[PDB]
Design a protein around this motif. Structure first.
Motif, PDB file in Angstrom:
ATOM      1  N   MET A   1      -8.835   2.146   7.441  1.00 21.64           N
ATOM      2  CA  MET A   1      -9.513   2.973   8.429  1.00 21.64           C
ATOM      3  C   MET A   1      -9.209   4.676   8.710  1.00 21.64           C
ATOM      4  O   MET A   1     -10.336   5.229   8.436  1.00 21.64           O
ATOM      5  N   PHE A   2      -7.962   5.093   8.806  1.00 21.91           N
ATOM      6  CA  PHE A   2      -7.537   6.537   8.809  1.00 21.91           C
ATOM      7  C   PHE A   2      -7.742   6.919   7.405  1.00 21.91           C
ATOM      8  O   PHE A   2      -8.007   6.144   6.361  1.00 21.91           O
ATOM      9  N   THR A   3      -7.631   8.137   7.176  1.00 26.81           N
ATOM     10  CA  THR A   3      -7.630   9.161   6.075  1.00 26.81           C
ATOM     11  C   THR A   3      -6.258   9.735   5.690  1.00 26.81           C
ATOM     12  O   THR A   3      -6.196  10.957   6.382  1.00 26.81           O
TER      13      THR A   3
ATOM     14  N   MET B   1      -2.017  10.452  13.171  1.00 25.74           N
ATOM     15  CA  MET B   1      -2.528   9.015  13.163  1.00 25.74           C
ATOM     16  C   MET B   1      -1.382   8.044  13.480  1.00 25.74           C
ATOM     17  O   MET B   1      -1.623   7.152  14.252  1.00 25.74           O
TER      18      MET B   1
ATOM     19  N   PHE C   1      -0.672   2.940  14.610  1.00 28.80           N
ATOM     20  CA  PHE C   1      -0.858   2.983  13.185  1.00 28.80           C
ATOM     21  C   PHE C   1      -1.009   1.791  12.305  1.00 28.80           C
ATOM     22  O   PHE C   1      -2.072   1.935  11.762  1.00 28.80           O
ATOM     23  N   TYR C   2      -0.090   1.105  12.213  1.00 30.86           N
ATOM     24  CA  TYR C   2      -0.364  -0.226  11.290  1.00 30.86           C
ATOM     25  C   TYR C   2      -1.053  -1.217  12.097  1.00 30.86           C
ATOM     26  O   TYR C   2      -1.680  -1.873  11.092  1.00 30.86           O
TER      27      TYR C   2
ATOM     28  N   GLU D   1      -4.155  -1.520  13.969  1.00 28.01           N
ATOM     29  CA  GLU D   1      -5.344  -1.640  13.275  1.00 28.01           C
ATOM     30  C   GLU D   1      -5.827  -1.446  11.927  1.00 28.01           C
ATOM     31  O   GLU D   1      -6.788  -1.364  11.592  1.00 28.01           O
TER      32      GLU D   1
ATOM     33  N   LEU E   1      -5.091   0.743   8.188  1.00 28.00           N
ATOM     34  CA  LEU E   1      -5.201   2.048   7.743  1.00 28.00           C
ATOM     35  C   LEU E   1      -5.459   2.353   6.313  1.00 28.00           C
ATOM     36  O   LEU E   1      -5.407   1.108   5.638  1.00 28.00           O
ATOM     37  N   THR E   2      -5.842   3.460   5.715  1.00 30.50           N
ATOM     38  CA  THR E   2      -6.221   3.761   4.568  1.00 30.50           C
ATOM     39  C   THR E   2      -5.548   5.093   3.920  1.00 30.50           C
ATOM     40  O   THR E   2      -5.417   5.990   4.693  1.00 30.50           O
TER      41      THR E   2
ATOM     42  N   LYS F   1      -6.288   0.434   0.938  1.00 30.05           N
ATOM     43  CA  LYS F   1      -6.294  -0.136   2.167  1.00 30.05           C
ATOM     44  C   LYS F   1      -4.683  -0.610   2.208  1.00 30.05           C
ATOM     45  O   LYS F   1      -4.427  -1.584   1.320  1.00 30.05           O
TER      46      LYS F   1
END
Length: 94
Positions: A1-3, A50, A56-57, A59, A61-62, A71
């Protein structure tokens, strides 16, 4: 999800890890579940946005490891809320 930005354990310079131990970064590791894990760079400040707390964990993340959108869900996310620390992060494939 995140960057979450990352690099193959190499900083702005030559060699490895000749900036993090002065600026504001720390190394982290990405596990899968077969092969040896990938030790990489991680920011401190930038990722805190983030991190926040547990979310953080939760939902998923990426991580962008030099244009590789790995991912992860992660397990031992050894962060500290309220006041930051971010000692180490042991990410795990999603």
């Amino acid at each position: 999800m995140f960057t979450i930005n990352a690099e193959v354990r190499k900083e702005q310079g030559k060699g490895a890890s000749r900036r993090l131990r002065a600026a504001n970064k720390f190394p982290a590791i990405i596990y899968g579940g077969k092969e040896a894990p990938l030790a990489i760079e991680l920011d401190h400040d930038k990722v805190m946005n983030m991190q926040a707390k547990a979310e953080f964990y939760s939902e998923v993340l990426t991580i962008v490891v030099d244009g590789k959108e790995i991912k992860v869900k992660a397990q031992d996310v050894q962060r500290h809320p309220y006041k930051p620390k971010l000692q180490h992060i042991d990410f795990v494939r999603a």
